[PDB]
Each structure stands twice: as C-alpha cells, then as structure tokens.
Structure 1
Amino acid sequence: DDIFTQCREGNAVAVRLWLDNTENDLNQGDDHGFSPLHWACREGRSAVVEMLIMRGARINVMNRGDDTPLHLAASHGHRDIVQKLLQYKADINAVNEHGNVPLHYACFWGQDQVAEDLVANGALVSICNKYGEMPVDKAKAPLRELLRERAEKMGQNLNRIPYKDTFWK
C-alpha cells in the first residue's frame, strides 16, 4: 500500500503525512504515470485533491496516455474537482495522445453538468481530436445541441478545427 492507493481510496490522513515528508515527490507518477493528483481526481477524492493543489502539486501533469488530472475528473463526472482544477489554472483544452480534451470525455460519458461547466469556462467545442471528432460530437443529441448553443452565446467560433500540433505535419 503506497501513496497512489491512499490517493485512490481517499485516505486523507495518510496522504497528509506522506506529503509532510518533503523528501517525497508529490508530482511523481506511478507505473503508468498517474500522479497522486491524477488518482485523487479520477476517484473523486475532493479533500485530497484540494490538499495536493494547495501544497503545490503541478496541475497539468500527464500520465502515459497524456491525460491530465482534469481529463480524469471530467471523464468520471467529478464536478467540484473540475471547478477546483479550473480555479487553479488547469489547461481546459489540454490534449492527450489521441488529441482528446477533457470536454471529449465529459461529452462521451454524459457528464452533462461538467460539460456545461467546461463550456461556461471557455472550453472549445469545435476542436477535432486526431481522428477528426469534435468534443461535442461525442455527446448524445440533447447535450450536443445545448453545448453548441451555449458555446455560440459565449462567443466561440463554431467552425470545425482539424487537429494540429507541433509534430503533426
């Protein structure tokens, strides 16, 4: 039983004690690159998430598939944690190895309130992943239509944006 398990399970006292030892590296990922913050965000462990952020955990850390903690919180529908990560300047349009952003996962898993919160905070709806799919197009129809409407009212341009990054071409 290690720091990763304590973060997954929400053993706040154990996590606190572990963080008290400054020789421990609070950003270090496990075997698949999941940091303590990734696990806490994935499993909805709000108090542990706050503790890690306030004690200086890097917010945009990536695991082996280039998911950030925000991707995980969004995918698993942890609304309070999404809001906390955004408060502390998480990159709302962070891309993983597939070019997916957190909104792709909120949409795909019907995490409607997280999806709406993301768009309210400026999350781009029109940005294709590496396979040409925009985040809102992973949603069921009601949510898909809603997020486009909300994005439009937030001053987004709704033109489809094909995937690009520094190494793409």
Structure 2
Amino acid sequence: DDIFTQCREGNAVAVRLWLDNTENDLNQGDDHGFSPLHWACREGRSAVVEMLIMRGARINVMNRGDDTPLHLAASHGHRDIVQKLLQYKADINAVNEHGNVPLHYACFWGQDQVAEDLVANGALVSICNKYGEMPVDKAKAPLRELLRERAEKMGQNLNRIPYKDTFWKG
C-alpha cells in the first residue's frame, strides 16, 4: 500500500495525504527508479498526474532504463497526460538507454493520436535510436507516411540522423 501502488491505482486521497507530509520525497523512485509521477503517467491516472505536477514533481525524472514519464504516457496511449507533461516543459525528444524517444513508443504501439500530437508539438521524426531505427519507422505504414508528411509541412528536415550522444564515441 505504498505511494507507488497508490499512484498506479489512482488513489487520489491517499496520494494527497502522503504528499501533505513534506518529509516524503515526491521525486524518489521505487526499486527500479519509477517515481510517483512515472507510475501515474504510465497507468493513465490524470488527476494524480496533475496533483503531482502542481505540487512540484520534477518532470524529466528517469527510471533505471532512463525512461521519463512522457515515454510512459506515450507508450501507453494516455493522450491528455502527454499534453499535460508537454505544457509543463517535458523534453519531447528525451532519450532512454536504447536511444528511444517517446515517439518511438507511440509509433510502435499504434497510439496514432498521441503520435500525431507529438509531431504537432515538434517531436523529431528522423532521429535514430542506438540501433539505427527512426521513431516513425516503428509505425505501420499509414501512420508512418502521415507523420513524415505532417513533419515536412511543419518544417522538419527528413534527413536520417544517426544516433549520437556525449559518450557514444569515446
């Protein structure tokens, strides 16, 4: 019945009472680094997501696989939560241990409206993960083509961008 379970389940009164004790650390991750905010986002618990954000939860926290809350909301198709996270300055191109961004997961799982919203907010379609796969190329064809069209008309360049980060080339 810890805070992580309450967030997964969307037990708003319990979460609110837990947060009322300022000795509790609302950013602290569980055994695999999932914060309260990660769980509420993953499971679609909109009211709890909002409560966490407005009480000061850090938006770009990372779990043990370097997923952010936005990766999880996108992956699980929670459209309103995606929008709330972006409003509160979530990094739309955040990068997990595999080089995947939130759009990779929205595409892979056919969360079409989330994927479209992400591109409408500027999410890059051409950025390869660590294994050379661009996010839109995880989608089925109708979505895949549509997102490239939407991105072009929003002024993106479609040139493939091989993966790089500060540690990639020693």
TM-score tier (shorter): over 0.9
Identity rate of aligned residues, in percent?
A: 100
Unaligned ranges ≥5, structure 1: none
TM-superposed CA distance for 1:78, in Å, is: 0.1
1:65-93 Cα deviation digits (max 9, x unpaired): 00000000000000000000000000000
C-alpha distance in 1, partners of 2:126/2:119?
Answer: 11
TM-superposed CA distance for 1:46, in Å, is: 0.2
1:26-77 Cα deviation digits (max 9, x unpaired): 0000000000000000000000000000000000000000000000000000
C-alpha distance in 2, partners of 1:16/1:157?
Answer: 45
Q: Which runs of 4+ in 1 moved over 6 A?
A: none
TM-superposed CA distance for 1:21, in Å, is: 0.3
Q: Aligned Cα RMSD in Å?
A: 0.2
1:100-123 Cα deviation digits (max 9, x unpaired): 000000000000000000000000
C-alpha distance in 1, partners of 2:63/2:42?
Answer: 12
TM-superposed CA distance for 1:168, in Å, is: 0.1
C-alpha distance in 2, partners of 1:166/1:26?
Answer: 30
- SS for the counterpart of 1:132 is coil
C-alpha distance in 2, partners of 1:107/1:115?
Answer: 6
TM-score by length of 1: 1.00
Unaligned ranges ≥5, structure 2: none
TM-superposed CA distance for 1:129, in Å, is: 0.1
Number of equivalences: 169
C-alpha distance in 2, partners of 1:19/1:155?
Answer: 42
- SS for the counterpart of 2:6 is helix
C-alpha distance in 1, partners of 2:56/2:120?
Answer: 26
TM-superposed CA distance for 1:142, in Å, is: 0.2
C-alpha distance in 1, partners of 2:56/2:125?
Answer: 30
- SS for the counterpart of 2:116 is helix
TM-superposed CA distance for 1:127, in Å, is: 0.1
TM-superposed CA distance for 1:17, in Å, is: 0.4
TM-superposed CA distance for 1:141, in Å, is: 0.1
TM-superposed CA distance for 1:164, in Å, is: 0.2
The corresponding residue for 1:168 is 168
Alignment of 1:89-104 (within 5 A): 89-104=89-104
